[PDB]
From a paper:
The PP2Cα is the prototype PP2C family phosphatase for which the catalytic mechanisms and cellular functions have been well characterized. The active site of PP2C is located at a cleft between two central β sheets, and it harbors a binuclear metal ion site required for catalysis. In the crystal structure of PP2Cα, the M2 metal ion is directly coordinated to the primary chain carbonyl of the Gly61 and the side-chain carboxylate group of Asp60.
We made a D38A mutation in PP2Cα, which eliminated the D38 side chain and abolished the indirect interaction between D38 and the M2 metal ion. To further elucidate the structural basis of the impaired function and catalysis of D38 mutants, we solved the crystal structures of PP2Cα-D38A and D38K with Mn2+ at 2.0 Å and 1.85 Å, respectively, and compared these structures with the PP2Cα-WT that was crystallized under similar conditions (1.95 Å). The positions of these two waters preclude M2 metal ion binding to the D38A mutant protein. However, the overexpression of an equal amount of PP2Cα-D38A mutant as the wild type only slightly decreased the EGF-induced ERK phosphorylation, and the overexpression of the PP2Cα-D38K mutant has little effect on the ERK phosphorylation increase. As a result, the βlg value of kcat decreased from −0.31 for PP2Cα-WT to −0.55 for D38A, and −0.44 for D38K.
Author numbering: 2 to 321, 327 to 368
Write the structure that this text describes.
Amino acid sequence: GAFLDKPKMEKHNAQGQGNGLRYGLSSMQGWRVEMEAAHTAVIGLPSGLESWSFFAVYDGHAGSQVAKYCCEHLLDHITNNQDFKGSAGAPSVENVKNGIRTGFLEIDEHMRVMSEKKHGADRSGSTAVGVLISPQHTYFINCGDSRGLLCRNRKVHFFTQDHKPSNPLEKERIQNAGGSVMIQRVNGSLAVSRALGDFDYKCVHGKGPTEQLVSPEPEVHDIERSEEDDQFIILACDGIWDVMGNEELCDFVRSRLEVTDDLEKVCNEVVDTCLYKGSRDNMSVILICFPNAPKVSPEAVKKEAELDKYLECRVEEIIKVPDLVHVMRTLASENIPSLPPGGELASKRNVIEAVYNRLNPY
Ligand SMILES: [Mn+2]
């Protein structure tokens, strides 16, 4: 299967600001032979929604085609349908939710017709996780096993529930569609129960679009915004969540924000950390900060410099020549205090490796 001999570490970054928001994002191919991730990041939507913003991560499987179409067109399918539009002036919460649902069902069918018409060869699919942010609400959107969360008042205020085939209601739909869940996989193949694309799994006669083996139906949750308490939102694929929990990543991201306001750097730190914790998947993360996101702290910055210097001195000493793996192993056995919460030693590997490289460049 995939797996390069060595991971592709190259970061694809973007950042922006507007509407009171700041964001950064990072995607990385990592250990996989193919890159099948995509994202959307836009502040200011067209057609009177200039005060609105939209961010999404798409985790492609069996190809990048579906993820790529979604990242460029999901938003317009969501906003340009009668359900979203309603209405009077400005969409109601119900307009937004129905509009999002209709957009998912319609882009799915759209791609299906395009493929049939052009005899498409790919059999790809994609998760989608995102937030549509209005002046007064954050609407979380989830379809698949990517995941998003909102940090408010230093805590995980909300996170999306992953769609897995073994989930009771998913299992039920799958079984009613003539299929089975074997361990965690639909008919022993697919490890997600909801996705755009995967049309081979949406061919059951006598069942509607949302009653197929795999469903394109998103789950949407409206959270009223809190200007005072809202801190940040994290959107990421399972490449991140497979190795870091909600609380851990929230704590870790806070610790990094206390050291720098460069959001691309914080996203890169998350991605590298997850690679070093053993993630062998593509990884994508979007970090969206609100006005009251944690601020850089002089004391945090000092502590980070102190820790870096301390690690540098440990490496010098441990090098009496042990390889990097053995140095990491020794450092781990020393139970070093004050490592980043959640990130731990893995989140300091870049600092450790840089010193190691200076001392053992060959
Ligand atoms: Mn993945």
